[PDB]
Paper text:
Taking meta-omics and enzymology analyses into consideration, we propose a non-classical cellulose degradation mechanism that involves the utilization of multi-modular enzymes that are secreted via the Bacteroidetes-specific T9SS. All five GH5 domains in this cluster were affiliated to GH5 subfamily 2, the largest of the GH5 subfamilies. Enzymes in this family are mostly extracellular and are endo-acting β-1,4-glucanases.
Cel5C contains two GH5 domains (Cel5C_N and Cel5C_C) that have 45% sequence identity to each other, and low similarity to their closest homologues, which consisted of individual GH5 domains (from single GH-containing proteins) from the known cellulolytic Bacteroidetes species Sporocytophaga myxococcoides (40–50% sequence identity) and Saccharicrinis fermentans (38–56% sequence identity). Comparing specific activities revealed Cel5D and the individual N-terminal GH5 domain in Cel5C (Cel5C_N) as the most active. Interestingly, Cel5C_N outperformed the full-length Cel5C_wt, whereas the other GH5 domain, Cel5C_C, had too low activity on CMC to determine the specific activity. Similar to the relative activities on CMC, Cel5C_N and Cel5D were the most active, releasing mostly cellobiose and some glucose from Avicel. In comparison, Cel5C_N generated ~ 800 μM of cellobiose from 1% Avicel in 24 h. Cel5C_N and Cel5D were too active to show the stepwise degradation of Glc(5) or Glc(6) in the assayed time points, degrading both substrates to completion in 30 s. Both enzymes produced Glc(2) and Glc(3) from Glc(5), whereas Glc(6) was converted to a mixture dominated by Glc(2) but also containing Glc(3). The structure displays a (β/α)8-barrel fold, typical to GH5 enzymes, although a comparably narrower active-site cleft was observed, similar to that of GH5 enzymes that specifically accommodate linear polysaccharides, such as cellulose.
Author numbering: 48 to 370
Write the structure that this text describes.
């Protein structure tokens, strides 16, 4: 039972129709929300209290759990939690999102230390995704992001497609209808190359990542090629900075990206909800010590203001029933 008036109450189980993500009543939906930073790095930032503030005060529709596979404390490392205990932690966060009625992305966050080819994480990715899809089959509010940012010159769409064709059957044997979001080459830029040979599965979307200090028209044009060839795109990560996550903020270029996404009804998730002293972090340093989840940085202020706009969906109605 999702809480009255919440994003999941309004839209129910989402699916993909052509290039558009739609609600349980078949209406186009654009979701807006926030990504975690590394969970092992900022655990004080990801609690019932902090997510309650994100929902009630920042008006988010969706939260993304960035589960690093590598670097210190990554899922594959057994440096912070055992793999099965990390699963239990993730499950707790998924349940908090359910209690608040927001969507939750489980993100297998490949990036560095060789994980740039997601195939090189399969010894852990297969049992991870087997577990998560079995555990969360009956959870209407989860989305499965199977490989954050494939990268490397050696990592082509053919290689990412082979990874996806290994993991998606493992998910779909347990959870037939849940949306799967598939990363693309060159740090989830090459959606136009994925569009040349798309996956044959239903309810699949393709990842686009941008950073407004780095990516401009060229990447929007690549994305438009993918859209014109019939792919549904999801911006599961973007920043207001250059791609490193620090330095200047570029709000004029981000406004261009926001207008562009709005016109195409493309969902977006901002990097990051954390109080690291870098300019892409949405909280001021020390906010996790004080517990003041509205003590925003310059970037957080800008994103919270975008989140405060009218919802980019229309309720499925039937408010006279519990959902």
């Amino acid at each position: 039972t999702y809480p009255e008036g919440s994003p999941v109450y309004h839209n129910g189980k989402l699916s993909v129709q052509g290039t558009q993500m739609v609600s349980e009543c078949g209406k186009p939906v654009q979701l807006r929300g926030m990504s975690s930073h590394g969970l092992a790095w900022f655990p004080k930032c990801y609690t019932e209290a902090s997510l309650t503030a994100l929902v009630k005060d920042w008006n988010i529709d969706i939260f993304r759990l960035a589960i690093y596979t590598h670097e210190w404390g990554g899922y594959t490392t057994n440096q912070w939690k055992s793999k099965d205990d990390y699963n239990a932690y993730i499950d707790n966060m998924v349940d908090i999102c359910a209690k608040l009625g927001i969507y939750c992305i489980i993100d297998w966050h490949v990036l560095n230390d060789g994980s740039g080819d997601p195939n090189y994480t399969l010894d852990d990715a297969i049992p991870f995704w087997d577990y998560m899809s079995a555990k969360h089959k009956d959870d209407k509010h989860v989305l499965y992001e199977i490989c954050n940012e494939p990268n490397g010159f050696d990592v082509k769409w053919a290689d990412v497609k082979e990874y996806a064709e290994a993991v998606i059957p493992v998910i779909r044997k347990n959870d037939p209808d849940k949306i799967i979001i598939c990363g693309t080459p060159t740090w989830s830029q090459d959606v136009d190359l994925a569009a040349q040979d798309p996956l044959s599965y239903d309810n699949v979307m393709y990842t686009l990542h941008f950073y407004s200090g780095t990516h401009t028209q060229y990447l929007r044009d690549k994305a438009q090629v993918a859209i014109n060839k019939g792919l549904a795109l999801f911006v599961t990560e973007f920043g207001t900075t250059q791609a490193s996550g620090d330095g200047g903020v570029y709000f004029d270029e981000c406004n261009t990206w926001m207008d562009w996404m709005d016109a195409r009804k493309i969902s977006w998730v901002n990097w990051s909800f954390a109080d690291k002293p870098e300019s892409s972090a949405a909280l001021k340093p020390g906010a996790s010590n004080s517990g003041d989840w509205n003590m925003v940085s310059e970037s957080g202020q800008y994103i919270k203001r975008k989140l405060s706009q009218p919802k980019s969906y229309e309720s499925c109605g039937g408010h006279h029933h519990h959902h």
